Amino acid sequence: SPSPLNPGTNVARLAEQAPIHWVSVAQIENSLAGRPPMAVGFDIDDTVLFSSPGFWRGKKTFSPESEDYLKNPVFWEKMNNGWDEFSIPKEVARQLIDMHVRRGDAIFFVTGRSPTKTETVSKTLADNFHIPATNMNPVIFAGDKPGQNTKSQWLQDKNIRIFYGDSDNDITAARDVGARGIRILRASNSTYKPLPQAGAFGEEVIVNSEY
Amino acid sequence: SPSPLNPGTNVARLAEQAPIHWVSVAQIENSLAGRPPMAVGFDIDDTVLFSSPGFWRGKKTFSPESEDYLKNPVFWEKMNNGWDEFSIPKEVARQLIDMHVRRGDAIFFVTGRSPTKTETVSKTLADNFHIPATNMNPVIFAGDKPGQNTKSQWLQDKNIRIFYGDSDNDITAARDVGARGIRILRASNSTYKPLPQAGAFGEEVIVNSEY
Amino acid sequence: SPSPLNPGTNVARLAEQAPIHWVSVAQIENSLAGRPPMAVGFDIDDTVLFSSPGFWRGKKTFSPESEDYLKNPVFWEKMNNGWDEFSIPKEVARQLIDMHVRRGDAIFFVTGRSPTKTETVSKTLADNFHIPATNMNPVIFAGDKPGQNTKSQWLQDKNIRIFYGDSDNDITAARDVGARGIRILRASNSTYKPLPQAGAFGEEVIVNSEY
Amino acid sequence: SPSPLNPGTNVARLAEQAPIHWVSVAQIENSLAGRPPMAVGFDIDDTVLFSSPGFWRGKKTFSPESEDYLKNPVFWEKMNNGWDEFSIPKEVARQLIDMHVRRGDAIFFVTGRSPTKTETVSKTLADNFHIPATNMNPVIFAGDKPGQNTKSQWLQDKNIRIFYGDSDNDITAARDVGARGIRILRASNSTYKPLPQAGAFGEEVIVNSEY
Ligand SMILES: Nc1ncnc2c1ncn2[C@H]1O[C@@H](CO)[C@H](O)[C@@H]1O
Ligand SMILES: Nc1ncnc2c1ncn2[C@H]1O[C@@H](CO)[C@H](O)[C@@H]1O
Ligand SMILES: [Au+3]
Ligand SMILES: [Au+3]
Ligand SMILES: [Au+]
Ligand SMILES: [Au+]
Ligand SMILES: [Mg+2]
Ligand SMILES: [Mg+2]
Ligand SMILES: [Mg+2]
Ligand SMILES: [Mg+2]
């Protein structure tokens, strides 16, 4: 700073590109041509669902000033049992999942959300993305609590070869097990802030994956 | 629709700019410096609230395979009386509303949503955006009637001198009454598509106003 | 800093716009519709000619480590009498000058280059941009030396209403006389560095004017 | 060709990225860490030198209204024996050449320019880019023969493992011999048009490499 009234710009800044390995769904699919059906995984939040409406609602209802709602079982019971009806499915996920289904791939969802006694997230996902039951697997609630296993342990267990996610820990989880971690852009209107530096580990990042 | 696997790019395309009158909130405040309190107006949907969650939910509930929910009074009762709890306030609106409160301006919201018997929208707005009683005015539900701009007469009636909105009809309403129409970007994960061409009437467009 | 190996990015940075009043040649022309023929002015370097080849040559020949060549009469005699045969005309200038000629405008060039006993720059310009002799005026070498007048004094003297330039002093010269200063982007391969903050004064900046 | 006066834009277009493998010089150096000295090669025109000044001049002098100058031996004598004094070294090339000198790599320049009896190009390059005698190799003038890639056999002959260039033929030459072909952006003010689609073979493209 200063942050000027009239900052101006220049054509070096206008054309400036960060050195990122951008990919398209079409190129990922091409990279898989001739590879046998495999298990692939997806993070949920900001990867396949824009779920910030429910998280916003939860914050505003359960902990208006902090992020305490994120460890409130009452919030999770609401979040995992219907508030995703207000979540907005990502077109990038529609494309990815359609093409993995077309390959005959096993599709897993592995989330850091807290587990709840029941969940309708598996159903919301299978329904919105038209995932055959054959390809579909119930959502895995991963983590460090008693009775849980971490994202990484789950990726190893289900032999997941590709993991799509928006968060750094999605990519490092894939890397820890030798899986191909592929980054999805977090939408700038997500309430999960700050936005990750997509590409921060040299991973592939999907173009235009914010929606 | 297919496209090349590796389309590539060039630095003319990388640097290319559309000829848009981009402005900041600071520049708008600066352009108004010295001007006494006035009435100003805001569209709601995709201008101050990312409300797609409620509309997406409404469509799924009331008209899965059409747009009839938008003409269903039961949908409007829900949307206007609680589903905005899932609507995500936009940062640009926080900045704009803060600036107009600093100015002592009278703030109006003029929405194309259908009027309902009761509404909790004015409450959600005055709360989310920390709007003092004196600057706040109850939401004007101008409704929607294709072939007709239902906002124009309201801007005239309330002597609104600046109108903010994401849609072409917001800008044309301001133009109709000789008010300064200022465009806000609709977020790319909005379910209201296609995205408008912000800048299409030569109007000012607020930078980074998608979130 | 750090300047990371793998910086990554996010979609707020990807979509980020500086708040600049970008214009196109088409919009400038539209803004002039019905305005009588007038005098308009152009800076030369990085506005209508990419002349860095001659300046590079001059530096390398006359002052390899400093910018002393810029005050070397021997350099100027070479620069103003043929080295612009290696200067690359800007498409943005072709468009501007064609449209000002089509309007019947008087066209002036006002440069901070040092005057020389003879110059072939006026000819290079008239020839490359197909400027009728009627519209064309000999290049004005402006400045602060004995026997010179400043850019500003020249703009006042020739009643210039619009001045196109890439440098801050081009825009301030127009502003000092009440003329409309319009910014052209300096190409990032110019050897005149650092690049200006185009738009730093709230002036109009021509889209894609780096070439 | 006409286009809308105020086309506008949207945030999907603002944020849109082509799926390009963008890399930095640091990332390239990092990918090579541990590898002993090797032969590497560079195209010249629009890869290390903005040489449009000499080509533009040549066209004006030898074939104002065609491309015949490119097949004129008198043009090549001038272009190869002094007109590069007007050619502007690219910063990306300074970074690349510095990095390959750090590595102890053997550096070759393989150009489509026609061989001439004498050439001062190798001198201009070794001087401009501060290239030690040991890393420097005399420029290979491979010439140009449409229908034939004249570079491929030279990369084979010199055991070149990495080839840098702006044109499709640079990348295809590297591919022909199983070398790593890396694209540099052609500057938008180059008179060699149209601009190539950098990234069109899925090859790495160097960020900000237009200058
Ligand atoms: N503010 C937020 N908006 C949307 N999703 C969130 C937010 N905070 C956390 N998440 C989700 O991302 C998961 C990663 O652990 C968290 O468990 C949570 O379910
Ligand atoms: N490095 C450069 N490359 C191109 N043009 C230059 C450079 N330095 C100055 N100029 C030109 O811009 C003019 C502005 O005063 C100078 O007089 C000079 O003619
Ligand atoms: Au890599
Ligand atoms: Au202005
Ligand atoms: Au609507
Ligand atoms: Au060529
Ligand atoms: Mg996530
Ligand atoms: Mg709206
Ligand atoms: Mg200049
Ligand atoms: Mg080349």
Residue in C closest to D50 by C-alpha = C189
CA angle A196, A201, A207 (to 5 degrees): 65
Tell me if residue A164 falls in helix, strand or coil: strand
| CA angle B39–B45–B46, rounded 5-degree value | 105
Does the distance separating the beta carbons of A19 and C195 come in below 8 Å?
no
Q: Are strands A106-111 and B180-183 parallel, antiparallel or unpaired?
A: unpaired
Q: Is A38 on the interface with D (CB under 8 A)?
A: no
| Closest of A192, A52, A185 to residue D11, by C-alpha | A185
Structure token digits, residue C99: 């449209």
Find residue A111's DSSP bridge partners. A141
CA distance C204 to C202: 7
> Chain C within 8 Å of A2 (Cβ-Cβ)?
no
CB contact (8 A) between residue B12 and residue D200? no
Contact of C136 with C107, CB cutoff 8 Å: yes
The first and second tokens of residue D30, run together, are 């990092």
**What's the alpha-carbon Rg for chain C, to the nearest Å?**
18
d(CA B210, CA A35): 40
Residues 6+ apart with CB under 8 A from B141: B80, B111, B113, B114, B115, B116, B119
Q: Which residue has the tokens 């900045």?
A: B95
Q: Which two tokens stand for residue A190?
A: 């997500």
**Contact call for residues B87 and B50 (beta carbons, < 8 A):** yes
Structure tokens, A172? 């490092």
D50/C191 touch (CB, cutoff 8 Å), yes or no: no
The question of whether C68 is a catalytic residue gets the answer: no
Distance from CA of A124 to the nearest CA of B (A): 12
Scanning chain D, the segments in alpha helix (DSSP H) are: 11-15, 25-31, 52-62, 73-80, 91-103, 121-128, 152-157, 168-177
How far apart are alpha carbons B198 and B185 in whole angstroms? 7
Calpha distance B14→B6 (Å, rounded) = 16
Task: Decide: residue B23, CB within 10 A, 0-12 exposed, 13-18 middle, 19+ buried.
Answer: buried
3-class DSSP state of A5: coil
C-alpha Rg value of chain B to the nearest Å: 18
Instruction: Kindly list the partner chains of chain C, i.e. chains with 3 or more CB atom pairs below 8 Å.
Output: A, B, D
What gap in Å lies between CA D197 and CA D97, rounded to an integer? Answer: 24
CB-based contact A90:A44 (threshold 8 Å): no
Query: What would the two tokens of residue C92 be?
Result: 């943005």
Query: Alpha-carbon distance B54 to A53, whole Å?
Result: 9
Q: Is the distance from CB of D137 to CB of D97 less than 8 angstroms?
A: no
Gap from B153 CA to chain A (nearest CA, Å): 32
CA angle A77, B49, B157 (to 5 degrees): 140
d(CA D141, CA D162): 18
For residue C143, give both structure tokens: 């400045």
Chain-centre distance for alpha carbon A132: 20
Beta carbons of B108 and B136 less than 8 angstroms apart = no
Tell me, in angstroms, the distance from the centre of ligand 3 to residue D26's CA. 12
CA nearest to A83 within chain B: B86
- Give, using CA atoms, the residue closest to atom 19 of ligand 2: C113
Residue carrying structure tokens 């002349």: C51
AA letter at C1:
S
Stated as kind and residue range, the H or E segment containing D49 is strand D49-50
d(CA A98, CA B158): 50
D207 and D184 in contact (C-beta within 8 Å)?
A: no
Which residues sit opposite B148 in a β-bridge? Answer: B145
Residue B169 alpha carbon to ligand 5 centre in Å? 11
Measure the CA–CA gap between C95 and C103, rounded to whole angstroms.
Answer: 12
CB-based burial, A25-56: b 16+ in 10 Å, e otherwise:
bbbbbeebeeeeeebbbbbbbbbbbbbbbbbb
Distance CA A78, CA A69 (A): 11
Q: How far is Cα C58 from Cα C106, in angstroms, rounded to an integer?
A: 32
Helices A91-103 and A25-32 sit at what angle, rounded to 10 degrees? 20
**Closest CA relative to residue B139, chosen from B53, B59, B45, B75:** B45
CB C144 within 8 A of CB C133: no
Structure token digits, residue C6:
């793998």
Cβ contact C189–D57 (<8 Å): no
Q: Residue A2: is the preceding peptide bond cis (ω within 30°)? A: yes
The dihedral built from the CA positions of residue C70, C74, C77 and C80, taken in this order, carries a sign that is negative
Architecture of the domain defined by B1-211: 3-Layer(aba) Sandwich (3.40)
By three-state DSSP, how is residue C17 classified? coil
AA identity, residue A200: A
> How far, in Å, CA of D54 to CA of C64, rounded?
21
Residue type (1 letter), D23: V
Closest atom, ligand 1, to C-alpha of A51: 4
Q: Decide if C202 and B27 are in contact by the 8 Å CB cutoff.
A: yes
Instruction: Select from D15, D90, D191 the Cβ nearest to the Cβ of C14.
Output: D15
Residue B22 carries which side chain, given as an amino acid letter? W
Backbone angles phi, psi at C21, to 5 degrees: -80, 85
Please state, in angstroms and as integers, the Cα–Cα distance from residue C63 to each residue in C55, C70, D22, following that order: 11, 9, 37
Q: Which of B91, B94, B103 is nearest to B39 (CA)?
A: B103
Q: Give the other-Cβ count within 10 Å of B127's Cβ.
A: 12
d(Cα A184, Cα A186) in Å, to the nearest integer?
A: 6
Q: Kindly compute the dihedral angle of the four CA atoms of residues D175, D180, D184, D186, in this order, to the nearest 10 degrees.
A: -10
Residues making up the annotated binding site of A for Mg(2+) are 43, 45, 166
- How many interchain CB pairs under 8 A, A with B? 69
Q: Is the CA virtual torsion A51, A55, A57, A58 positive or negative?
A: positive
Q: Give CA D186 to chain center in angstroms.
A: 8
Of D20, A193, A173, B184, the residue nearest C10 (C-alpha): A193
CB C122: neighbour CB atoms within 10 A?
A: 16
d(CA C92, CA C173) in angstroms, rounded, equals 21
Neighbours of A63 (CB within 10 A): 15
Q: Identify residue A168 by its one-letter amino acid code.
A: D
Distance of CA A50 to the CA centre of its chain: 9
Which residue of D3, D5, D6 to mutate against B (max B Cβ within 10 Å)? D6
Q: Cβ-count burial of A150 within 10 angstroms (0-12 exposed, 13-18 middle, 19+ buried)?
A: middle
CA distance B43 to B48: 7
Residue nearest to atom 14 of ligand 1 (CA): A112
Query: Exposure of D132 by Cβ count < 10 A (0-12 exposed, 13-18 middle, 19+ buried)?
Result: exposed
Closest CA to C29 of C206, C178, C208, C211: C206
Segment holding C3, helix H or strand E? none
- Taking contacts as CB-CB distances below 8 angstroms, the residues of chain A near C7 are 18-19, 197, 199-200
Neighbours of chain A (3+ CB pairs under 8 A): B, C, D
Q: Is A80 in the pocket of ligand 1 (CB under 6 A)?
A: no
Query: Encoding tokens for residue D65?
Result: 């209204």
> What's chain A's Rg over C-alpha atoms?
18
- How far is the centre of ligand 5, averaged over its atoms, from the C-alpha of B192 (Å)? 7
H/E segment holding residue B93:
helix B91-103
Q: Are B25 and B96 in contact (CB under 8 A)?
A: yes
> How far is residue B113 from each of residues B161, B172, C99, measured CA to CA in Å?
22, 17, 46
Rounded CA separation A193/B167 (Å): 27
Nearest to B198 by CA among B189, C26, B187, B190: B187
Mark which residues 3-22 of D lie under 8 Å from B by CB: 4-12, 14-15, 18-20
User: Nearest Cα to B144, choosing from B120, B174, B175, B110?
Assistant: B110
Joined together, the tokens standing for residue A162 give 């590709």
The token pair that represents C45 in the structure block: 């370097």
Name the residue among B76, B70, B53 with its Cα closest to residue A85: B53
**Contact call for D19 and A210, based on CB within 8 A:** no
The encoded tokens of residue C64 equal 């390899």
Token code pair at residue C190:
């110019």
Task: Report the Cα–Cα distance between both ends of chain A, in Å, rounded.
Answer: 32
Q: Per the CB < 8 Å rule, is A211 touching D23?
A: no
Around Cβ D67, how many Cβ atoms within 10 Å? 9
Joined together, the tokens standing for residue B111 give 């929405």
- Whether C106 contacts C137, CB under 8 Å: yes
Annotated domain spans of chain C = 1-211
> Cα–Cα distance between C145 and D103 in angstroms, integer?
51
Contacts of B37 by beta carbon, 8 Å cutoff, 6+ apart = B103, B104, B105, B106
Name the structure determination technique. X-ray
> Ligand 2: does its nearest atom lie under 6 Å from the Cβ of C113?
yes
Question: And the tokens for D69?
Answer: 């100058």
The CB density around residue C48, as the number of other CB atoms within 10 Å, is: 26
Residues in D 183-202 with any Cβ partner in B closer than 8 A: 185-188, 195-202
Distances (CA, A) of D150 to A131, D153, D164: 52, 7, 15
Which tokens go with A16? Answer: 């400036």
Q: Give one DSSP letter per residue of C62-125, joined into a string.
A: H-TTSSGGGG-HHHHHHHTTTGGGG-EE-HHHHHHHHHHHHHT-EEEEEE-SPP-SS--HHHHH
Q: How far is CA D149 from the centre of its chain?
A: 15
Interstrand relation of A21-23 and A204-206 (parallel, antiparallel or unpaired): parallel
The tokens of A68 are what? 């305490």
The residue with tokens 């897993």 is A108
Cβ-defined contact of B11 to D186 (cutoff 8 Å): yes
For residues C54 and C86, the answer to whether their CB atoms sit within 8 Å is yes
Which ligand has the minimum distance to the alpha carbon of residue C192? 2
Binding residues of A: 43, 45, 111-112, 151, 166
Taking CA atoms, A27 is separated from A186, B210, C165, in Å, by 21, 28, 44
3-state SS, residue B83: helix
Of the candidates C207, C159, C205, C196, the residue with the CA atom closest to the CA atom of residue C21? C205
Q: How far apart are the first and last CA of chain C?
A: 32
**Which chain B residue has its CA at the smallest distance from A64's CA?**
B128
Indicate which residue's Cα is closest to atom 5 of ligand 1: A52
Question: Within 10 A of D204 (CB to CB), how many other CB atoms are there?
Answer: 22
Q: Is the CB of C170 under 6 A from ligand 2?
A: no
Q: How far apart are CA A110 and CA A153, in angstroms?
A: 11
Residue A181, beta-bridge partner list? A163
User: Three-state SS for C61?
Assistant: helix
C45 touches ligand 2 (CB under 6 Å): yes
Residue A15 carries which DSSP code? S
Q: Cβ(D84)–Cβ(D49) under 8 Å?
A: yes
Query: Which one of D60, D189, D192 would you mutate to disrupt binding with C, by most C Cβ within 10 Å of its Cβ?
Result: D189
Q: Which amino acid is at B43?
A: D
Residue B84 one-letter amino acid: D
Give first-to-last CA distance, chain B, whole Å: 29
Contacts of C201 in chain A (CB under 8 A): 6, 8
- Could you give the CA distance from residue C124 to residue D58 in angstroms, rounded to a whole number? 15
How many contacts, defined by CB atoms under 8 Å, are there between B and C? Answer: 41
Give phi and psi for B105, each to the nearest 5: -70, 150
Pocket of ligand 2, candidates C192, C193, C195: which has the most ligand atoms within 8 Å of its Cβ, to mutate? C192
Distance from chain centroid for Cα D210: 11
| Beta-carbon count within 10 A of A2 CB | 5
Distance CA C168, CA C112 (A): 13
Q: Whole-angstrom Cα distance, residue D107 to residue D84?
A: 19
Return the half-sphere exposure (C-beta side, CA atoms, 13 A cut-off) of residue A160: 32
Q: How far is the C-alpha of D198 from the C-alpha of D211, rounded, in Å? A: 15
Of C190, C175, C161, C200, nearest in space to C42 by CA: C161
Q: Give the strand pairing for C140-141 and C106-111.
A: parallel
Q: Are A59 and B86 in contact (CB under 8 A)?
A: no
DSSP, res B71:
G
